[PDB]
Design a binder for this molecule. Structure first.
Ligand SMILES: Nc1ncnc2c1ncn2[C@@H]1O[C@H](COP(=O)(O)OP(=O)(O)NP(=O)(O)O)[C@@H](O)[C@H]1O
Ligand SMILES: Nc1ncnc2c1ncn2[C@@H]1O[C@H](COP(=O)(O)OP(=O)(O)NP(=O)(O)O)[C@@H](O)[C@H]1O
Ligand SMILES: [Mg+2]
Ligand SMILES: [Mg+2]
Ligand SMILES: [Zn+2]
Ligand SMILES: [Zn+2]
Lengths: 431, 431
């Protein structure tokens, strides 16, 4: 009985579900974040190698055996489980194939798991140039001492890789394996990026520390629609792993703490016998970016969705942000939307009425302190509480009020709070 | 060098890009419509077989060799070309796998190409029950005289099919091959449909001649959001192949002719050195379903998209429909949307201003015949011209005014117009 075949055109096909390029990037960040990899840092960068513009993703997580690498370069192999409260966001076994092939036509992955090293090629131009009618994935293995195991399939694989990748020679290729600093980790290089006329779909020159897009669905565009730095900073509700973008760490935040005048409420849907936490407050940065932030398994699905009175006109609920994690809804479209079900519609309706009650309540509370014709939208605001992530242990710590300009690196030992001045103290509850 | 593998979980994964179930159905209609199959009729029905509720799709097109069937049950094999002005809508090599697996977990296809017969199984429950780690596709071949060729792979295939499909025995299975009436054709049966609690995601009982859904994106829902019969009737701008749904033919229409007070204009985008045809008029059926119908390669992508003054409020441009085919835009999301590019945004903006000019012009023209406080939205209207499809040759014919109740079958010989009373006369130009 014959195997279902997989034509290399399908590497392109499979990538077309990413219309916004940052959803492809988020697939690669998600893989380093997930608990089976459990990386502490991921580095994203632009480099030039062999006169090609290149995207690299390097993490210091657990790495892969040569076999799991072949599963990563295959379709539908996903077996992620929760590990000590850290639930995986991946589950379909497609994020790397569709994401990498959306950013470029060719990708190579170097991985060390401590006891071994492997490198794999997933390359549309390679499959084109050899006129393949199946997708084949050259994989070569190495050991602790830099010698090739499974030489059987490693010979033809190495021949293909040296001829048809960016590395002409074997030690240039093993040079990437050393760019993974510690004992364990992985490194992905993507080239033949998507171009329009001449230059790339991304804008690397406008800001040396960002990747930018030269507005979707639509108001003014929130920064996260066109700045990778802005998108990374809200991608995770409570971030663990850190993101370093072109050498400068991304100021990820505890999104549920980034607001002013915070009120905590709960949603009690009838279709579900659980209660759901909701947080409302005012944006502090730019009163023009408001609406609901919707998360699923700690990952951002929809940002700045206007609800309640914010749909009627641009005079009402301006500045009001709501934050909810909806694990009862179904993410779709590469975790950029929810299935438009009845439960979705009821949640949106309830969110809108809670938003309305919060906003009217806030107008009233404001009117007991400030002038009556002064709109609450317009009072200058800073976060009710400022929380910072330790750069050593990645715990989140609450700082005392008034602290604005924090160093780029911060450690529990810098903490003015003597109760939380050592990395062993468990995180404080957000309440 | 190892082949990239394909895990059976990926049959589910690959299907999740269909959120609206009718987009899965349209993938199967599209395959019968395309010029390499070139079917004249497709039959869609609900039946019960072996106590399972079943969806069947039967067409009288060209059928498949045993090999192309294996390519259809594989990923990314697509080589469709235009044939005498009939351009294929398919191009990604995924529509059947993602569509069929969205409707049910298991599908079987019977096909005759005249010189042969084959049947293939693509079945999630089969792959589960044998604990497969690869997707395998049992295919067995037959000849003109009902004898098995390529017996090598036909033995194990037939064993799997008889055990793990709806047909216990070999002549029950060859009974489906005979349900394909003529010499050439194909028949697809899908079972283990998607259920919610007990019953299916579709509603077969509410209307014996329709498949219904028990509103998307949002006004009132157009019928095409929840009635397969309504959706099929507008799926193709100029239909060729006919659709018979649960035994009753779908009244497909020449969509560009279904309007009243038609004005023809052209769009002259600067980013493209072609002109683009546009038709505006008033809906005749239900003044509540209006906006732009957007087609791509004769296939409907977006229906009832409000533009221009129709976005400002529900008082303006009510009833106004526009029809445009945008082959310069990029369909996405299984041909249910366009990539949200700059060209898309400029087209939407130009459509809106042309819509505004048409509507104001029509209000003025109306005010020279009817009372001034009578809204043009409200005058009763019938199509400017009625066009009917010959049931023998599938050409479209213009009928003289006043003809309302046409038979269910109609032929060029019924034509009151003596110039167009025989199937050999080429179609009249739409102007
Ligand atoms: N940086 C990485 N380091 C180690 N393992 C990885 C890494 N990236 C991916 N993997 C592994 O490759 C497998 C496939 O990744 P992927 O294609 O993204 O599917 P998935 O994450 O399991 N589910 P999904 O993202 O929703 O499609 C994952 O399950 C991981 O086990
Ligand atoms: N009813 C049918 N009769 C004969 N051939 C068919 C039929 N349906 C599908 N095929 C063939 O199966 C192949 C794969 O179909 P499909 O998976 O829908 O990909 P595609 O139509 O080529 N492109 P796309 O629909 O955009 O993914 C098609 O290219 C056809 O050659
Ligand atoms: Mg993933
Ligand atoms: Mg198709
Ligand atoms: Zn610490
Ligand atoms: Zn005729």
């Amino acid at each position: 009985i014959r195997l279902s075949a997989l034509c290399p055109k399908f590497l392109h096909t499979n990538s077309t579900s990413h219309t916004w390029p940052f959803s492809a990037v988020a697939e690669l960040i998600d893989n380093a974040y997930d608990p089976d990899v459990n990386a502490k840092q991921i580095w994203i960068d632009k480099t030039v190698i062999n006169d090609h513009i290149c995207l690299t993703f390097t993490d210091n997580g657990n790495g892969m055996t040569s076999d799991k690498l072949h599963k990563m370069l295959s379709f539908g192999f996903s077996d992620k489980v929760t590990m000590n409260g850290h639930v995986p966001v991946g589950l379909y076994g497609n994020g790397f194939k569709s994401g990498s092939m959306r950013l470029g036509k060719d990708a190579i992955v170097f991985t060390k798991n401590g006891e071994s090293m492997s490198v794999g090629l997933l390359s549309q131009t390679y499959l084109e140039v050899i006129k393949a009618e199946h997708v084949v994935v050259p994989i070569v293995a190495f050991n602790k001492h830099r010698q090739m195991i499974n030489l059987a399939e490693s010979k033809a694989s190495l021949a293909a890789i040296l001829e048809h990748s960016l590395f002409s020679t074997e030690q240039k290729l093993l040079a990437e394996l050393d760019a993974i600093i510690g004992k364990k980790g992985t490194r992905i290089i993507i080239w033949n990026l998507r171009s329009y006329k001449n230059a790339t779909e991304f804008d690397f020159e406008k800001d040396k520390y960002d990747i930018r897009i030269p507005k979707k669905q639509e108001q003014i565009a929130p920064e996260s629609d066109y700045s990778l730095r802005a998108y990374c900073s809200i991608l995770y509700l409570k971030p663990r792993m850190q993101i370093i973008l072109r050498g400068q760490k991304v100021k990820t935040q505890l999104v549920s703490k980034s607001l002013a005048y915070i009120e905590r409420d709960v949603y009690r849907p009838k279709f579900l016998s659980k209660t759901v936490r909701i947080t409302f407050g005012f944006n502090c940065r730019n009163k023009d970016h408001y609406g609901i932030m919707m998360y699923h398994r700690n990952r951002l699905i929809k940002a700045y969705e206007k609800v309640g009175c914010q749909l009627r006109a641009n005079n009402m609920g301006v500045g009001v942000v709501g934050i909810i994690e909806c694990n009862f809804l179904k993410p779709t479209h590469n975790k950029q939307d929810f299935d438009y079900t009845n439960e979705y519609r009821l949640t949106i309706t309830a969110l809108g009425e809670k938003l309305n009650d919060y906003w009217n309540e806030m107008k009233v509370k404001k009117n007991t302190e400030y002038p009556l014709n002064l709109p609450v939208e317009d009072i200058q605001k800073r976060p009710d509480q400022t929380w910072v992530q330790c750069d050593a242990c990645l715990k989140w710590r609450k700082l005392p009020d008034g602290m604005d300009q924090l160093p780029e690196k911060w450690y529990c030992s810098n903490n003015p709070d003597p109760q939380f001045r050592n990395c062993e103290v468990p995180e404080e509850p957000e309440d």
